[PDB]
Design a protein around this ligand. Structure first.
Ligand SMILES: O=C(c1cc(-c2nnc3ccc(Br)cn23)c(O)cc1O)N1CCc2ccccc2C1
Length: 208
């Protein structure tokens, strides 16, 4: 297990998200679905010139999996997945300018729901989650687990859990007062409201 510090500005954004009183928390789900859709776009495009890139799984989709017992909400996609370099460096590097600009906008009166317009919507997960675990597998690399409970650091390790094939699974370990996002009706409401124009099937797994 390796431990890394977030980029300074990303650590600052995460602290703001965690400590600002903000009731409209449901935006996190829209942002995570949008990121999954982008990842799916990437593998779909690559497969147009090289169909063998889908040998790790032909189905392109997003699954939403609430678990009341574990108090987790998992967002699974079969997109392109992330390499180790993506996890440690690249996603942080792409997000730097958007992060800086978003924090400036927040100081100039913008609201947290605009986070997606700056390309850093992933961090809105911390509106509802005390910890986030991300399992990922890219065709060109091993399966990895990324994890952060904020506080300025994240970890990356090789994952020896169940093989994913290809894609990314975001596991939100929800705060005690945020269990509404494990309810079927609530999840459906949010998806219908925010994510009606996504070009891949979104399936809610109903709890037994
Ligand atoms: O595989 C993915 C992907 C990434 C994120 C995601 N978005 N922001 C972050 C921040 C940290 C972590 Br861990 C995951 N993040 C996500 O929510 C879902 C995903 O399917 N991607 C997402 C973006 C991307 C960009 C370039 C190349 C590959 C990929 C692959």
């Amino acid at each position: 297990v390796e431990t890394f510090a977030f980029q300074a500005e990303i650590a600052q954004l995460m602290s703001l998200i965690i400590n600002t009183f903000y009731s409209n928390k449901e935006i996190f789900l829209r942002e995570l679905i949008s990121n999954s859709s982008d990842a799916l776009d990437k593998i779909r495009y690559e497969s147009l010139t090289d169909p063998s890139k889908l040998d790790s799984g032909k189905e392109l989709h997003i699954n939403l999996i609430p678990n009341k017992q574990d108090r987790t909400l998992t967002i699974v996609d079969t997109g392109i997945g992330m390499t180790k370099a993506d996890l440690i460096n690249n996603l942080g590097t792409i997000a730097k300018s958007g992060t800086k600009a978003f924090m400036e906008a927040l100081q100039a009166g913008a609201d947290i729901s605009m986070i997606g317009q700056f390309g850093v919507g992933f961090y809105s997960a911390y509106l509802v989650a005390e910890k986030v675990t991300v399992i990922t597998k890219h065709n060109d690399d091993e399966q990895y687990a990324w994890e952060s409970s904020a506080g300025g650091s994240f970890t990356v390790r090789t994952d020896t859990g169940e093989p994913m094939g290809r894609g990314t699974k975001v596991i939100l370990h929800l705060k005690e007062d945020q269990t509404e996002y494990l309810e079927e009706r609530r999840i459906k409401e949010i998806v219908k409201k925010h994510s009606q124009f996504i070009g891949y099937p979104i399936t809610l797994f109903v709890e037994k």
